[PDB]
Design an enzyme around this catalytic site. Structure first.
Site, PDB file in Angstrom:
ATOM      1  N   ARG A   2       0.822  -1.206   0.000  1.00  7.34           N
ATOM      2  CA  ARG A   2       0.000   0.000   0.000  1.00  7.34           C
ATOM      3  C   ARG A   2       0.855   1.255   0.000  1.00  7.34           C
ATOM      4  NH1 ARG A   2      -4.871  -2.626  -1.387  1.00  7.34           N
ATOM      5  NH2 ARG A   2      -4.960  -0.862  -2.834  1.00  7.34           N
TER       6      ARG A   2
ATOM      7  N   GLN B  11     -15.898  11.207  11.131  1.00  5.90           N
ATOM      8  CA  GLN B  11     -15.874  12.680  11.198  1.00  5.90           C
ATOM      9  C   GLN B  11     -14.928  13.196  12.279  1.00  5.90           C
ATOM     10  OE1 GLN B  11     -19.567  14.691  12.158  1.00  5.90           O
ATOM     11  NE2 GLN B  11     -18.950  16.583  11.104  1.00  5.90           N
TER      12      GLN B  11
ATOM     13  N   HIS C  98     -11.079  14.830  11.291  1.00 13.64           N
ATOM     14  CA  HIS C  98     -10.999  16.273  11.504  1.00 13.64           C
ATOM     15  C   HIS C  98      -9.825  16.738  12.381  1.00 13.64           C
ATOM     16  CE1 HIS C  98     -14.517  16.486   9.130  1.00 13.64           C
ATOM     17  NE2 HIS C  98     -14.938  17.663   9.557  1.00 13.64           N
TER      18      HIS C  98
ATOM     19  N   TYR D  44     -13.454  -7.213   4.930  1.00 17.20           N
ATOM     20  CA  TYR D  44     -12.587  -8.379   4.762  1.00 17.20           C
ATOM     21  C   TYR D  44     -12.759  -9.379   5.896  1.00 17.20           C
ATOM     22  CZ  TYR D  44      -9.762  -5.728   1.296  1.00 17.20           C
ATOM     23  OH  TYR D  44      -9.307  -5.006   0.219  1.00 17.20           O
TER      24      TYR D  44
ATOM     25  N   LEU E 111     -11.480  12.819  -1.075  1.00 19.09           N
ATOM     26  CA  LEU E 111     -12.180  11.522  -1.151  1.00 19.09           C
ATOM     27  C   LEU E 111     -12.894  11.149   0.139  1.00 19.09           C
ATOM     28  CD1 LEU E 111     -10.804   8.958   0.471  1.00 19.09           C
ATOM     29  CD2 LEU E 111      -9.135   9.035  -1.402  1.00 19.09           C
ATOM     30  N   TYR E 112     -12.511  11.787   1.246  1.00 20.44           N
ATOM     31  CA  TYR E 112     -13.061  11.476   2.565  1.00 20.44           C
ATOM     32  C   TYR E 112     -14.330  12.257   2.862  1.00 20.44           C
ATOM     33  CZ  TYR E 112     -11.326   8.508   6.398  1.00 20.44           C
ATOM     34  OH  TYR E 112     -11.106   7.474   7.274  1.00 20.44           O
TER      35      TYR E 112
ATOM     36  N   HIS F  91     -20.309  12.612   3.070  1.00 24.61           N
ATOM     37  CA  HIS F  91     -21.586  13.149   3.567  1.00 24.61           C
ATOM     38  C   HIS F  91     -22.799  12.268   3.263  1.00 24.61           C
ATOM     39  CE1 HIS F  91     -18.810  16.615   3.820  1.00 24.61           C
ATOM     40  NE2 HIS F  91     -19.364  16.671   5.018  1.00 24.61           N
TER      41      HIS F  91
ATOM     42  N   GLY G  62      -7.774   5.390  -1.281  1.00 30.01           N
ATOM     43  CA  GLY G  62      -7.959   5.584   0.149  1.00 30.01           C
ATOM     44  C   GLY G  62      -7.018   4.747   0.991  1.00 30.01           C
TER      45      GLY G  62
ATOM     46  N   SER H  30      -4.390   6.345   3.853  1.00 31.42           N
ATOM     47  CA  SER H  30      -4.790   6.015   5.220  1.00 31.42           C
ATOM     48  C   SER H  30      -3.724   5.252   5.982  1.00 31.42           C
ATOM     49  CB  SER H  30      -6.075   5.179   5.206  1.00 31.42           C
ATOM     50  OG  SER H  30      -6.422   4.745   6.510  1.00 31.42           O
TER      51      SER H  30
HETATM   52  C1  HEM Z   1     -22.813  15.190  10.847  1.00 28.73           C
HETATM   53  C2  HEM Z   1     -23.156  16.172  10.019  1.00 28.73           C
HETATM   54  C3  HEM Z   1     -22.107  16.847   9.113  1.00 28.73           C
HETATM   55  C4  HEM Z   1     -22.180  18.124   8.737  1.00 28.73           C
HETATM   56  C5  HEM Z   1     -23.293  19.119   9.141  1.00 28.73           C
HETATM   57  C6  HEM Z   1     -21.043  18.411   7.901  1.00 28.73           C
HETATM   58  C7  HEM Z   1     -20.767  19.623   7.305  1.00 28.73           C
HETATM   59  C8  HEM Z   1     -19.559  20.010   6.774  1.00 28.73           C
HETATM   60  C9  HEM Z   1     -19.138  21.376   6.516  1.00 28.73           C
HETATM   61  C10 HEM Z   1     -19.994  22.640   6.786  1.00 28.73           C
HETATM   62  C11 HEM Z   1     -17.900  21.337   6.009  1.00 28.73           C
HETATM   63  C12 HEM Z   1     -17.046  22.554   5.586  1.00 28.73           C
HETATM   64  C13 HEM Z   1     -17.293  22.813   4.094  1.00 28.73           C
HETATM   65  C14 HEM Z   1     -16.511  23.997   3.540  1.00 28.73           C
HETATM   66  O1  HEM Z   1     -16.104  24.906   4.334  1.00 28.73           O
HETATM   67  O2  HEM Z   1     -16.307  24.015   2.279  1.00 28.73           O
HETATM   68  C15 HEM Z   1     -17.509  19.948   5.938  1.00 28.73           C
HETATM   69  C16 HEM Z   1     -16.314  19.460   5.491  1.00 28.73           C
HETATM   70  C17 HEM Z   1     -15.878  18.159   5.591  1.00 28.73           C
HETATM   71  N1  HEM Z   1     -16.628  17.044   5.934  1.00 28.73           N
HETATM   72 FE1  HEM Z   1     -18.459  17.145   6.840  1.00 28.73          FE
HETATM   73  N2  HEM Z   1     -20.299  17.251   7.792  1.00 28.73           N
HETATM   74  C18 HEM Z   1     -20.921  16.258   8.519  1.00 28.73           C
HETATM   75  C19 HEM Z   1     -20.471  14.957   8.646  1.00 28.73           C
HETATM   76  C20 HEM Z   1     -19.336  14.448   8.058  1.00 28.73           C
HETATM   77  C21 HEM Z   1     -18.935  13.062   8.048  1.00 28.73           C
HETATM   78  C22 HEM Z   1     -19.674  11.870   8.684  1.00 28.73           C
HETATM   79  C23 HEM Z   1     -17.787  12.970   7.387  1.00 28.73           C
HETATM   80  C24 HEM Z   1     -17.024  11.655   7.147  1.00 28.73           C
HETATM   81  C25 HEM Z   1     -15.721  11.601   7.360  1.00 28.73           C
HETATM   82  C26 HEM Z   1     -17.410  14.292   6.954  1.00 28.73           C
HETATM   83  C27 HEM Z   1     -16.292  14.624   6.226  1.00 28.73           C
HETATM   84  C28 HEM Z   1     -15.863  15.891   5.928  1.00 28.73           C
HETATM   85  C29 HEM Z   1     -14.518  16.234   5.557  1.00 28.73           C
HETATM   86  C30 HEM Z   1     -13.320  15.283   5.407  1.00 28.73           C
HETATM   87  C31 HEM Z   1     -14.536  17.738   5.319  1.00 28.73           C
HETATM   88  C32 HEM Z   1     -13.362  18.654   4.939  1.00 28.73           C
HETATM   89  C33 HEM Z   1     -13.059  19.404   6.231  1.00 28.73           C
HETATM   90  C34 HEM Z   1     -11.785  20.197   6.143  1.00 28.73           C
HETATM   91  O3  HEM Z   1     -10.929  19.922   5.267  1.00 28.73           O
HETATM   92  O4  HEM Z   1     -11.635  21.112   6.990  1.00 28.73           O
HETATM   93  N3  HEM Z   1     -18.379  15.168   7.364  1.00 28.73           N
HETATM   94  N4  HEM Z   1     -18.538  19.161   6.394  1.00 28.73           N
HETATM   95  C1  LIG Z   2     -10.227   5.604   3.435  1.00 24.99           C
HETATM   96  C2  LIG Z   2     -10.647   4.165   3.254  1.00 24.99           C
HETATM   97  C3  LIG Z   2     -10.596   3.798   1.793  1.00 24.99           C
HETATM   98  C4  LIG Z   2      -9.669   3.257   3.951  1.00 24.99           C
HETATM   99  O1  LIG Z   2     -10.329   2.104   4.465  1.00 24.99           O
HETATM  100  C5  LIG Z   2      -9.780   1.030   3.814  1.00 24.99           C
HETATM  101  C6  LIG Z   2     -10.590   0.296   2.977  1.00 24.99           C
HETATM  102 CL1  LIG Z   2     -12.220   0.774   2.780  1.00 24.99          CL
HETATM  103  C7  LIG Z   2     -10.100  -0.796   2.291  1.00 24.99           C
HETATM  104  C8  LIG Z   2      -8.787  -1.166   2.486  1.00 24.99           C
HETATM  105  C9  LIG Z   2      -7.977  -0.421   3.324  1.00 24.99           C
HETATM  106  C10 LIG Z   2      -8.460   0.669   3.992  1.00 24.99           C
HETATM  107 CL2  LIG Z   2      -7.371   1.537   5.010  1.00 24.99          CL
HETATM  108  O2  LIG Z   2      -6.641  -0.681   3.562  1.00 24.99           O
HETATM  109  C11 LIG Z   2      -6.242  -2.018   3.239  1.00 24.99           C
HETATM  110  C12 LIG Z   2      -6.440  -2.907   4.432  1.00 24.99           C
HETATM  111  F1  LIG Z   2      -7.725  -2.919   4.869  1.00 24.99           F
HETATM  112  F2  LIG Z   2      -6.074  -4.179   4.110  1.00 24.99           F
HETATM  113  F3  LIG Z   2      -5.684  -2.500   5.473  1.00 24.99           F
HETATM  114  C13 LIG Z   2      -6.962  -2.591   2.072  1.00 24.99           C
HETATM  115  C14 LIG Z   2      -6.289  -3.593   1.161  1.00 24.99           C
HETATM  116  O3  LIG Z   2      -6.979  -4.304   0.379  1.00 24.99           O
HETATM  117  O4  LIG Z   2      -5.034  -3.493   1.221  1.00 24.99           O
HETATM  118  C15 LIG Z   2      -8.200  -2.253   1.740  1.00 24.99           C
END
Ligand code: HEM
Ligand SMILES: CC(C)COc1c(Cl)cc2c(c1Cl)O[C@@H](C(F)(F)F)C(C(=O)O)=C2
Ligand code: HEM
Ligand SMILES: *[C@@H]1O[C@H](CO)[C@@H](O[C@@H]2O[C@H](CO)[C@@H](O)[C@H](O)[C@H]2NC(C)=O)[C@H](O)[C@H]1NC(C)=O
Ligand SMILES: *[C@@H]1O[C@H](CO)[C@@H](O[C@@H]2O[C@H](CO)[C@@H](O)[C@H](O)[C@H]2NC(C)=O)[C@H](O)[C@H]1NC(C)=O
Ligand SMILES: CC(C)COc1c(Cl)cc2c(c1Cl)O[C@@H](C(F)(F)F)C(C(=O)O)=C2
Ligand SMILES: CCCCCCCCO[C@@H]1O[C@H](CO)[C@@H](O)[C@H](O)[C@H]1O
Ligand SMILES: *[C@@H]1O[C@H](CO)[C@@H](O)[C@H](O)[C@H]1NC(C)=O
Ligand SMILES: *[C@@H]1O[C@H](CO)[C@@H](O)[C@H](O)[C@H]1NC(C)=O
Lengths: 552, 552
Positions: A89, A172, A176, A324, A353-354, A357, A495, A499
């Site tokens: 990986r 989340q 974050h 798995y 990619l993360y 939502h 991913g 990761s």
């Molecule tokens: C629970 C309700 C949630 C709300 C209301 C919400 C809302 C938001 C908002 C307002 C932003 C900032 C957007 C911008 O400024 O362009 C954001 C960014 C983001 N969200 Fe969510 N979100 C939620 C849940 C989640 C979940 C479950 C994930 C899964 C990992 C997630 C992943 C992300 C990520 C990775 C970013 C980029 C943040 C950064 O780079 O600072 N969010 N979201």
């Molecule tokens: C952000 C998400 C995509 C990461 O969550 C994952 C997901 Cl969904 C799958 C694999 C993974 C991670 Cl970390 O890492 C490895 C694992 F699981 F073997 F460790 C893997 C593999 O086939 O090598 C597959």
């Protein structure tokens, strides 16, 4: 006019202009030669004939449960398998890191400036005739059209893997700490200068903030008691900066490491649980070490909680997401006879990619109640009303939404999905297919291949015209899922490299850190090595409620 | 108080208190076990019998010049030897880093805070009864007494290896990009946040300073022409801050990357040479790449200069300093199939051992003038009057002082020598013999073993009483030199591991950076791989004066 605009170099070869309209590909260590690094060397030909497809691998890993049951109980075999996944990986990641949003060639600025997200692929040059380089039209399709035609939820699509809300809010909360985009600078910039799992979202980025959050007795974090239960302290007690809308009363302005965590009660739930876990580990360390002072109790606890975090992320969170049958393992010793860089720089594309939502439900279900978004957001009275135990029990039962498969982003958050599309373009991301090659996937030849159906595929063709012009972010959300799985191919294959590098790159995984004395002895070391999502909740939530990342 | 005050754990075992009056050693991966990690493993016993001492090795490498002549002319062997020296030396350094002046145990603070110098050995804890732990008296001997009796020069003692002023000023100039103590914070803190060879002393630490020093046409650095000769611009011209006493005229206030470089004409000599070199490589790259803008030409030149710098330091500077007949090689390829961390954190002890002021003569001899320190300090008139050609010619001819052997610190810099002693103590350094152990050396059993003579040894024995109480810094400057060598054992054995890790840890040495495209193609790649101190001077100084790091 930049002659590298067509992205002509293949198989990780690097393009360089050699004149106003000619280029040269650097094929060094690609395993290929030729003008475009597409003529393979003998050994590469053989290696590519004996490499199974990612989908082939997925099948074998998600079937034959009886065999994996046996394999899982043969440690040297389990260790061999996991050793191979970790190293194979991680070779997909550039480390030390290379490009960023401003640099499509390596530079000391792009290497040294920690304020940037790094880039798995360099940005498309400013002077290229199209947004993706040379292919497609002068402008990408209207992002609102894309958003509405293929991303927005019509009817809730539950995750077939049964991911629950304990998982959604964990993803989340966990991410974050390292996704913290500096909006003062721009989308290609970060405020998480640690670039990994440092638990700044519990302890704070800076020392000043950390010191305001700390009790300076027994290594602990300040806290308050409300109705007999431990919660984080207030903005008024600690003086730490948080993001809160102007109407939130002082007594509900909770102070935690991450300034935005008071805005989602699911985030505040995990902030409380971890604060609780930190203070608990201080009591165990003080028992083992009555000589120790506050500083060392605090620092050692922080190291242990980092280990607990990587342990849980690998063995429970990734275990669940992957689907798995093979039992994944957190074991730093796996890499000690292996070539590995104990460092990481967070990738912009990993941020992109993360954006999961689609996981979010149309309502949040705690006990009898069903809360809309408007009711749920910025509302910690709900946490106090129901308490953690009921939060855990409820969120363990509530199904999250499927991420790939299309048309499952909630409208409540449609502006966030629009901004994802718009900021990818602003940051000049290369196309879906360029990123697929980057991670050794076969480019898609049509939109039907991408989606695995005909309706969304047809809408996408009308918008993009050419599959080679399709964008990364929408593709991830629209991609054909694996059978009864939460994600498609691309999500897993980009991913997994980002990761695992971030998890195993941590300095605590290095051989000089990974020994008992780093964590206060065997008692401290055991806490990391036995950590689980179940045990985290069991030790810190009243009544030891059952929990898991899947709906039971 | 702390039960680990006596430094009980041997062989890199880590000590941890387990109660007010008890400790435990963590012997993980030391190759030993037992209460104090002193019981060797079977495999370990064998290696300790076959392993020759550093002095036995030093003799071999400095004799049999005929045999070395043949080895040097056999590429695969030369490579195989250089591979081994690199890897074997680098395993002496903790990487990722561990301790610093405030943390004698591993902590996220000591890992993450780039403003500290790291520490090869942790500090002696505050509650220990003696400065060295438990051994010795409650106070170390008066630093002034140590300084006067065994460090200060009576009569200039020449370096028998024939090091010259070109060498002495290359050392000061090169090292002062990574030794930049932050006196606002204290001796254990650095302003050199790149922690390595980033050429901030040419380009500035901060983006704002870089930009002030840049021309923004053709990738170049600002310059002026005085008497048909290129020199750096002025403070007034560029608004970049330099340390100059107020009486220095504005036309002599030269602005360069490193703020302290106007303090010494010898530094400014190299500052001019390297500025000229940057602008020279810009011209080279502009020829090859007419398509390129100013950003890319500047960034690419800097990566080539960093390459040139590492090349010269290994193949000219270390080559000379080692006294070895084996021909050392800068070749990143040597590490690609080996385990190696491409990162570095600058150690406090490396800074301390690199205080080589005994190199300085009593007067600096240029053309027919003999300048005292007073006359030479902050006097760039000297440089403009004589010119670069004459500086190189003069400094090439003037021999530097021997560093080990004792009594060769110039009196003009006694306050610096006293400070090195006083700061080591403030930073709570462990003893000379602890550092020897740390680096696989046998502890000295008397002051006469240390010095190889009787007079200074006796002076030292009256002052310190126990050999185990003796301090690192004075010991290095009194140590018995190798036969006709500039340094003793301890300097080489601690200094080589720190030096080579800093050099090879640079990211331009990593697989993804070390290819032609990173340096603008084969032509720029060739500039690195053929660099030498002679060619640096020949390309940039009028008349291509002969130069070398040693007297002819
Ligand atoms: C629970 C309700 C949630 C709300 C209301 C919400 C809302 C938001 C908002 C307002 C932003 C900032 C957007 C911008 O400024 O362009 C954001 C960014 C983001 N969200 Fe969510 N979100 C939620 C849940 C989640 C979940 C479950 C994930 C899964 C990992 C997630 C992943 C992300 C990520 C990775 C970013 C980029 C943040 C950064 O780079 O600072 N969010 N979201
Ligand atoms: C952000 C998400 C995509 C990461 O969550 C994952 C997901 Cl969904 C799958 C694999 C993974 C991670 Cl970390 O890492 C490895 C694992 F699981 F073997 F460790 C893997 C593999 O086939 O090598 C597959
Ligand atoms: C040319 C005449 C020189 C003078 C006048 C001089 C003077 C000084 C002074 C005053 C300091 C203390 C700086 C401070 O505390 O802010 C210092 C530190 C130092 N010197 Fe020199 N020195 C000279 C040459 C050299 C040489 C040839 C070397 C060899 C490498 C050297 C190595 C060092 C180092 C490594 C430090 C510590 C720097 C730091 O921590 O920032 N010096 N010197
Ligand atoms: C890292 O890069 C950013 C972008 O260049 C730097 O931020 C800019 O700094 C300049 C000059 O100091 C300002 O004029 C800009 O407004 C800044 N922000 C942006 C978004 O351009 C930042 O200083 C760099 N950081 C470091 C530590 O070098
Ligand atoms: C790295 O550590 C130093 C020392 O602990 C920090 O410097 C101190 O910062 C605080 C403000 O929070 C001041 O009150 C002190 O006076 C500072 N200097 C010293 C010498 O103590 C520094 O902030 C830390 N750097 C980071 C990025 O956290
Ligand atoms: C800062 C000063 C002390 C560094 O200068 C040196 C000196 Cl003086 C000796 C060696 C060294 C370096 Cl770097 O590194 C290596 C060498 F020469 F082989 F590369 C070495 C060895 O025996 O392995 C010995
Ligand atoms: C002058 C050539 C012989 C050197 C003798 C050095 C013995 C230490 O003598 C010291 O010298 C210092 C610097 O001059 C003075 O500041 C001190 O007062 C003096 O005690
Ligand atoms: C927040 O939830 C609490 C408890 O249910 C309650 O005060 C109120 O209904 C909610 N507030 C909003 C704005 O929805
Ligand atoms: C500086 O050097 C010049 C020669 O360039 C000399 O004449 C002058 O006296 C020196 N200045 C000082 C302050 O010693």
């Amino acid at each position: 006019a930049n002659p590298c605009c067509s992205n002509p170099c293949q198989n990780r070869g690097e393009c360089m202009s050699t004149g106003f309209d000619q280029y040269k590909c650097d094929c060094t260590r690609t395993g290929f030669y030729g003008e475009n690094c597409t003529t393979p060397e003998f050994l590469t030909r053989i290696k590519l004939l004996l490499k199974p497809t990612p989908n082939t691998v997925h099948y074998i890993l998600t079937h034959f449960k009886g065999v994996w049951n046996i394999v899982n109980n043969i440690p040297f075999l389990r260790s061999l398998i996991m050793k191979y996944v970790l190293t194979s990986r991680s070779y997909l990641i550039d480390s030390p890191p290379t490009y960023n949003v401003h640099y499509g060639y390596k530079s000391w600025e792009a290497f040294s400036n920690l304020s940037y997200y790094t880039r798995a692929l360099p940005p498309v040059a400013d002077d290229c005739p199209t947004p993706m380089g040379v292919k497609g039209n002068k402008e990408l399709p209207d992002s609102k059209e894309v958003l509405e035609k293929v991303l927005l939820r019509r009817e809730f699509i539950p995750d077939p893997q049964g991911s629950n809300m304990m998982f959604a809010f964990f993803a989340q909360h966990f991410t974050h700490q390292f996704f913290k985009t500096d909006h003062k600078r721009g989308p290609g910039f970060t405020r998480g200068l640690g670039h990994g799992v440092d638990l700044n979202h519990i302890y704070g980025e800076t020392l000043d903030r950390q010191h305001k959050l700390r009790l300076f007795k027994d290594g602990k974090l300040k806290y308050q008691v409300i109705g007999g239960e431990v919660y984080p302290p207030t903005v008024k007690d600690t003086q730490v900066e948080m993001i809160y809308p102007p109407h939130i009363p002082e007594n509900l302005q909770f102070a935690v490491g991450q300034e935005v965590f008071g805005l989602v009660p699911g985030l505040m739930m995990y902030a409380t649980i971890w604060l609780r876990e930190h203070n608990r580990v201080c009591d165990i360390l003080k028992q083992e070490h009555p000589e120790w002072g506050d500083e060392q109790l605090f620092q050692t606890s922080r190291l242990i909680l980092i280990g607990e975090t990587i342990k849980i992320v690998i063995e429970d969170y990734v275990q669940h997401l992957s689907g798995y049958h093979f039992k994944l393992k957190f074991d730093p010793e796996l890499l000690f006879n292996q070539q590995f860089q104990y460092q990481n720089r967070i990738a912009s594309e990993f941020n992109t990619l993360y954006h999961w939502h689609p996981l979010l439900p149309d309502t949040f279900n705690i006990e009898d109640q069903e809360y809309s978004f408007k009711q749920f957001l910025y509302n910690n009275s709900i946490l106090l009303e129901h308490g953690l135990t009921q939060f855990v029990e409820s969120f363990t039962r509530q199904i999250a939404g499927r991420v790939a498969g299309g048309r499952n982003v909630p409208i409540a958050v449609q502006a966030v999905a629009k901004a994802s599309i718009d900021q990818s373009r602003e940051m000049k991301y290369q196309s879906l297919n360029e990123y697929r090659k980057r991670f050794s996937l076969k480019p898609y030849t049509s939109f039907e291949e991408l989606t695995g159906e005909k309706e969304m595929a047809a809408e996408l063709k009308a918008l993009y015209s050419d599959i080679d012009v399709m964008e990364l972010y929408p593709a991830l959300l629209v991609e054909k899922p694996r059978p009864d799985a939460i994600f498609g191919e691309t999500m897993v294959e980009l991913g997994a490299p980002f990761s695992l590098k971030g998890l195993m790159g941590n300095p605590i995984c290095s051989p000089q850190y990974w020994k008992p004395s780093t964590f206060g002895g065997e008692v401290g070391f055991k806490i990391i090595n036995t950590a689980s999502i179940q045990s985290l909740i069991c030790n810190n939530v009243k009544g030891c409620p059952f929990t898991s990342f899947n709906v039971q």
